[PDB]
From a paper:
When building atomic models into weak and/or low-resolution density, a common strategy is to restrain their conformation to that of a higher resolution model of the same or similar sequence. When doing so, it is important to avoid over-restraining to the reference model in the face of disagreement with the experimental data. Here, two new such potentials are described: a Cartesian distance restraint derived from a recent generalization of common loss functions and a periodic torsion restraint based on a renormalization of the von Mises distribution. Further, their implementation as user-adjustable/switchable restraints in ISOLDE is described and their use in some real-world examples is demonstrated.
Manual checking and (where necessary) rebuilding of the reference model is often advisable, particularly for older models; in many cases the output from automatic rebuilding and re-refinement by PDB-REDO may be a better starting point than that downloaded directly from the wwPDB.
Numbering used by the authors: 33 to 133, 135 to 194, 217 to 242, 264 to 349
Write the structure that this text describes.
Amino acid sequence: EPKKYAVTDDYQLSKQVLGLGVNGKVLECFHRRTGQKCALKLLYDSPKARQEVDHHWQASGGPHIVCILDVYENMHHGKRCLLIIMECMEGGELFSRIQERDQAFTEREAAEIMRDIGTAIQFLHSHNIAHRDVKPENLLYTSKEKDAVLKLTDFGFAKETEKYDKSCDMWSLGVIMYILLCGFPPFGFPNPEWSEVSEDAKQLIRLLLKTDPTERLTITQFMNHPWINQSMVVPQTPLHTARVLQEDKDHWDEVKEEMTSALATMRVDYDQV
Ligand SMILES: O=C1NCCc2[nH]c(-c3ccnc(-c4cnc5ccccc5c4)c3)cc21
């Protein structure tokens, strides 16, 4: 299953960094014989690294999941490492693409995005995998083109399960959906940004952002909600999202940082009350 020969036999590596995960850095690379641009995640070997490889491998091929192409077990700097070769997500991050629109971003488009993310979580939860770190850095597009596909990645905190772990994914969906609809995170629905958002959308968010994890919707309830299930019928209402993301771009790193912190807090064995 994992290739034991040198990854450089098959791939020409670059030093262009494409992203950073808890277990390793993500580099650009090129398949030596097809020329296809790909992404290489370098994981120094460990049980956590073996878990990530195992979980991403099982999830690879599922809807809206970044696909693994190859996995290599190599020696690097005298250390045993695992190299995950993934499809190159040349469209970049979800919210950067929205930010780079001027053009109308509609509530229907947010509903289609959320349905895509929910489809990925639905696949994972039906295979007893909870992601536990769904966040802007992990939501990527296959290309900069209009027909790009949104996919989830990074299984470094994934866990084979537990209703609590799955409810942390559902909380992530509510946070992402909140930002999708107004351009700032929930950490009420203030006017003017939320003035014209439908009642279905605000109802779904409140059901996902319950403080009590047992009160949060499951992914099945999420996918059956009319805002998701009937996402095509969702009003084409133009949102403030792109404009707000541009206006607040200097604070975007802080938004990502506190979401990362909130997600890590949900993963601790024992937390304060
Ligand atoms: O596992 C991860 N944890 C943290 C972030 C991340 N990005 C990736 C990743 C994977 C594949 N392609 C990319 C990628 C992202 N952004 C790009 C922008 C422009 C060109 C290529 C890009 C590739 C990123 C994986 C991970």
